Amino acid sequence: SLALSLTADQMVSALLDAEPPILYSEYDPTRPSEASMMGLLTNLADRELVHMINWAKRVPGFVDLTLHDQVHLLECAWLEILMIGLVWRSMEHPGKLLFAPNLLLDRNQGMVEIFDMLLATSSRFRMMNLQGEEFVCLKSIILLNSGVYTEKDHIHRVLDKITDTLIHLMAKAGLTLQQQHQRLAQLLLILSHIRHMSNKGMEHLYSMKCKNVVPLSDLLLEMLDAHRL
Amino acid sequence: SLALSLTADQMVSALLDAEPPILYSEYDPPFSEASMMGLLTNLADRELVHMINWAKRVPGFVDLTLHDQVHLLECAWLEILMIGLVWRSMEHPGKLLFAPNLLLDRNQGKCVEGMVEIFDMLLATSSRFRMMNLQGEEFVCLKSIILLNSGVYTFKDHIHRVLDKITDTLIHLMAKAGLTLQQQHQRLAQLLLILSHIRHMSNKGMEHLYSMKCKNVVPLSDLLLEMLDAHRLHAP
Amino acid sequence: KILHRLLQD
Amino acid sequence: KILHRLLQD
């Protein structure tokens, strides 16, 4: 494996290097809906999915897994990863969600529930002063962790390396050992909520599908079908 | 608030002592969908009464407004039942020990639609606990974290301070078992990541319990119904 | 809510 | 399966 070999400071490089780009929406401000909005987010997520899949290949250890397991991990984690990316984007926009640079929304424009949860996560990141370096670690942890219970050993080793890396980072920022433990736990506990938001989100999308009003792209339908069968 | 003045040895003891008892199912012995879901629903209902008592005894929980206490239990109750279940099931690889006289396997919950998915997830969590050699001391810390954490972002400093205290305590238990520093934060992380899976199982379970309520073939209790209604669900 | 009762008790 | 392809390339 190539992943079990990295310095902590190396791991960060690779994860930072691997970051996907921030895509734009087709939002035209001259037009003011929940169907239009969801049409845009769906289009956006569909294009992001392509960059995420090619990002996943760049996560240390990921490429080492069998194609069936790679597929399973992404099927499982894709909305979690879209969502943590979103809340990170949105950190420095109190009260708003930066879906794209040209699409920055507040809770005012079920659906509200998810928004409020995304907003509270973004908010939590902000009060924690989350670092880009801590963030890319978390996002990688989600990709590897969320589908691991649903080869498995190699996965646990990379997770452990990413833990090592998170701690390496916090030691750098001057934190006492007690403070590193707590921050580490604090970050990983947010992933519980990110899982929650993803679940609620997936259910919302499943019912959008049935209503057949906001069409889902072909990949989004396949990834969504993964979560029901 | 008293919770923050506890040592971590004092924390372990309050938690080990707050532990709810292990309830039995109805006696008398094959299962059908509805007799099975009856047994579990009855058991869950009786377990909830003890859970509330246990929650009132998790340090720092009573320091919360009545409303916030309510919010946390409503969000976390199935997570808490489920982690209890996989903890009991640890010594029974392959089976789910819902109650000492109610020890079920995969083939059994297959006679309910969508149940074997959840059975398999719960069993997988149980394996991982067993492979990690999860300790009772660690277990009660985890269960308390679920209670305080799962609902906190849908409301906090106090709670987060209590969450911190439990992290200290977890770590304290690890330093005792002779774990190196690296081993400590690797096992801390390993434990906490399984909380993400427990959350996933709860949400899957919650939708399933909502199917049931729409079927009206297994009657839910007034209380269970209120716990369930607080997730609103359906397809949320 | 039953929950309220059980908690105050 | 689309994800399958894409991963493959």
Ligand SMILES: Oc1ccc(C(=Nc2ccccc2Cl)c2ccc(O)cc2)cc1
């Ligand atoms: O078809 C889709 C797919 C994804 C989204 C999405 N977020 C949501 C998903 C479900 C419910 C609510 C939101 Cl905001 C989302 C999209 C892109 C992101 O970068 C983040 C989230 C919305 C509609």
Ligand SMILES: Oc1ccc(C(=Nc2ccccc2Cl)c2ccc(O)cc2)cc1
């Ligand atoms: O009405 C109910 C309430 C709770 C349960 C329950 N587990 C499940 C819940 C939903 C789906 C599947 C299971 Cl196994 C469960 C009950 C008690 C426990 O100790 C653990 C789990 C089942 C039916």
